[PDB]
Amino acid sequence: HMPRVKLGTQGLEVSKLGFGCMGLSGLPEEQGIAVIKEAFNCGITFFDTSDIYGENGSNEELLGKALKQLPREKIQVGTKFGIHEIGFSGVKAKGTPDYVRSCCEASLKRLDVDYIDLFYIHRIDTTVPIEITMGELKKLVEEGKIKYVGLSEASPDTIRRAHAVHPVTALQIEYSLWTRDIEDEIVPLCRQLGIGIVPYSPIGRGLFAGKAIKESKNKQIYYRIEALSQKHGCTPVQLALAWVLHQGEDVVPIPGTTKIKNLHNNVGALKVKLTKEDLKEISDAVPLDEVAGESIHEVIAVTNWKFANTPPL
Amino acid sequence: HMPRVKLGTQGLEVSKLGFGCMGLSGLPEEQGIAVIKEAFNCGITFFDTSDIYGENGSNEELLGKALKQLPREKIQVGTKFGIHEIGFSGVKAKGTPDYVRSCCEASLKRLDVDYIDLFYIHRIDTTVPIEITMGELKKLVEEGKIKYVGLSEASPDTIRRAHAVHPVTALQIEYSLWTRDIEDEIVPLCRQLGIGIVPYSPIGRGLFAGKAIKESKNKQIYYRIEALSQKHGCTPVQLALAWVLHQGEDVVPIPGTTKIKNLHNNVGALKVKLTKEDLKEISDAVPLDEVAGESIHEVIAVTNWKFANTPPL
Known part of the structure; x- marks a missing residue:
């Protein structure tokens, strides 16, 4: 079954494998819950969210709803604070102690839990x-509001000092x-x-010059990969x-998906063994x-204008 | 000198040429003002901003500061409301009448003016x-808080109905x-x-999969253009x-720049005449x-992590 690891x-x-909740908000709630139940049924107990995901913390509220149908003592909840404002081409972080406290307490109520296992600085x-x-x-930890602290996207100096x-x-x-720049110093x-x-691996959507965007010789490189995956009895x-x-053994990826089938495929990855x-x-x-x-x-x-329509009277 | 047009x-x-203030916030204020003064000195009297630009409407505050050094009765101020929340891959618009009113009144105080010439729904x-x-x-207009109404990025149905x-x-x-899809129906x-x-032409920056992004046979197409610009005694x-x-005669572009020299180059474009x-x-x-x-x-x-550092104690 699912191996478990000390993080x-x-x-x-x-x-060993966690689950990223972000994509569950983008759609329908009850199906969101089912993805979560299903993940737990495959042995995933570590679920990742943030105050910033969804709309007014709807992603945390969705998780907190899944947890009502689950043995929460068996689940590790990861959430985050610190992104204060997303603007057109930049993100404003906020780490004053007041904000830390209020974000925490706010996530606790959206999730409807008495504590958060792992609470990160998100930016x-x-x-x-x-x-x-x-x-x-540190304070939150001693009060038992959170159990463990995480950092996200931190420089070595921040890491050491934290x-x-x-x-x-x-x-x-x-x-x-495809992105291994942490190997030099961070790891x-x-x-x-x-x-x-x-x-x-963040999900490839965003905003460019105010427009919604998604991501789309070279094929010789995709053939290398597919051929190796075929060789390893798995998908790319x-x-x-x-x-x-x-x-x-200290690495715990947290892929997300909105589909049960992609979930199962991620779990499958654990069976692949590589020398x-x-x-x-x-x-x-x-x-x-x-x-x-x-x-x-x-x-x-x-x-932006194609579907900038409004409900008739 | 600058031709003027009924909009x-x-x-x-x-x-005939307006000026987009967005880029002036991204940097230094006093240089921002100077770009604005300079633009007005070249005959540009139409200045475009929005509540959403800069940080807590710092772009409007910057303009409102330029205006203190200018004959505001001679300037047409365009600002906007309606973008309520920018999230990771999407934008939340808000058009309830309360919000319209409060955004208006808020822009009036950031700009420090008694009225706004042209106030748009931004999304x-x-x-x-x-x-x-x-x-x-309509109400704002009759109260004299604004003189004229604009739409941004609206469907034909919204346009007709507005x-x-x-x-x-x-x-x-x-x-x-490079983007002419409005010619079919909108125009x-x-x-x-x-x-x-x-x-x-929005400025090419944004956020993709949570990361800051900027924009970067084909050259045969750049040579077509450069050759035509050379032929027309101007830059591409x-x-x-x-x-x-x-x-x-009803078209008024509002290019922005942070540089006086690019400003002058835009003004120069008016001298080019095309059959x-x-x-x-x-x-x-x-x-x-x-x-x-x-x-x-x-x-x-x-x-995100390279420079995610913090001020030492």
């Missing part, structure tokens, strides 16, 4: 020493076969401080997940980005 | 009949050599209702602006999008 060094245990407030934000979190104030259980950050640092690593999607899973040599083969099939961090993406934009 | 049919007159609230939103605007409640002075929408409709057209940037300017035949040549040099509205863009994303 970080403070006591948190999670299923680092660059105007506020991390020590101060970590101080309030950790000195109260131990960080996990760092959630983008890491996949060894997490391994040195005993901090679990929670990779994700599973092979990418498997590569992540194999990057360490040190099968992994380098897979690493080598995919070129690293020219500049660390920079990545080039082709996206399709759609105009 | 819409209710009395609004603007400079159409798809849950609220447009008649209702237009009703409050116009029946109170005349629409202008429609601001994306229109350029002829504006011409039939006597509604001015305010084209823009000016040639694109000139093409827009020539699409009708019906020079324009079709220019239209023909640029292929239309395969699917109306859809456009494909290549963008560079950067990771």
